[PDB]
Amino acid sequence: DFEEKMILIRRTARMQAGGRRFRFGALVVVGDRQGRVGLGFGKAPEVPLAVQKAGYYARRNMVEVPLQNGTIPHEIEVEFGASKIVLKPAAPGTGVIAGAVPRAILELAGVTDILTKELGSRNPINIAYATMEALRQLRTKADVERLRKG
Amino acid sequence: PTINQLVRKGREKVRKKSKVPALKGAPFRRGVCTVVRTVTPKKPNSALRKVAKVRLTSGYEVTAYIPGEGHNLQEHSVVLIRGGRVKDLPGVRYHIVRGVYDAAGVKDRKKSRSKYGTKKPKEA
């Protein structure tokens, strides 16, 4: 079913008298490598509860990637915050050519051949959201034809 | 900037500044020792860093670090400079190449010998 990759887990701190008080945040990707990917960011007082919370959160909020021979239907560029992500389709044998965060998603996404590029802010967390959005916006000659019927 | 502006003034290309006027933009420069002092570290660090004023053939008079457990440098010893600052010693921008000219290599160096210019010890 769903494979589960963990993008990043950070320690993040907070202040009270007497001192610092940490929380952990975990970004987790979940996919079947078939065309379903979900991203979830879960925070908790412990690394595990965090990953688990993220996993669960990712599982809810999945995106349907219109794969086509392991690659994508067209190039989209998406800005999210100061993070800009760029996806370009590739032929077979190209590989998933992207930085970690983007890749990890694209892999479980089921993609197997793409050209990528992170531009602007490279905050993993924002590049992640940026990627997911880019995937959501993908369309197919089908959808497009459908959209312009009337 | 408007396109017409770009056409008028246009972008100005950025210019990098060297961090090693070993002049001649050379890989190494040889100089003569002047003072084999011993400076003290900065901010936190503490110790007796071994340094040396050097009169380069490049016309420059500089301060250079002397890596290694123990050296043999004196007043007028010929040396080779390789460039590389030392975070703790403000004013030292080059290291001295051990194993070249008058700077002998480090004795009893059984590891990173490539640096500290020490020949391969013959295992008895």
């Binding site: - | 396109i3 017409n4 770009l6 056409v7």
Partner: protein, 104 residues
Amino acid sequence: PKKVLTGVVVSDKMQKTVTVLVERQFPHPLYGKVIKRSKKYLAHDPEEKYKLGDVVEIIESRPISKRKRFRVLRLVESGRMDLVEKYLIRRQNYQSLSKRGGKA
């Protein structure tokens, strides 16, 4: 083909010679917009025919003098100082922007 050009006579101050101001256009090699530069050619006018304001066709010729390799092939349209004006007015701003400054 001996190169042929069209411009305006912005100067009739010389003997048997005139200053033709040939305009030119083209796409900027990197920013693509069509920019427009211009150059002045000294053309040979034997008959002292062509007058200030004339639009003429210049033709690549055999050197006549130093800095003068064009002959007035022919007249395209007479009188029209509206052009000479631009050229002169532009020369006028030069009359400053140095230690003083060009009017407006």
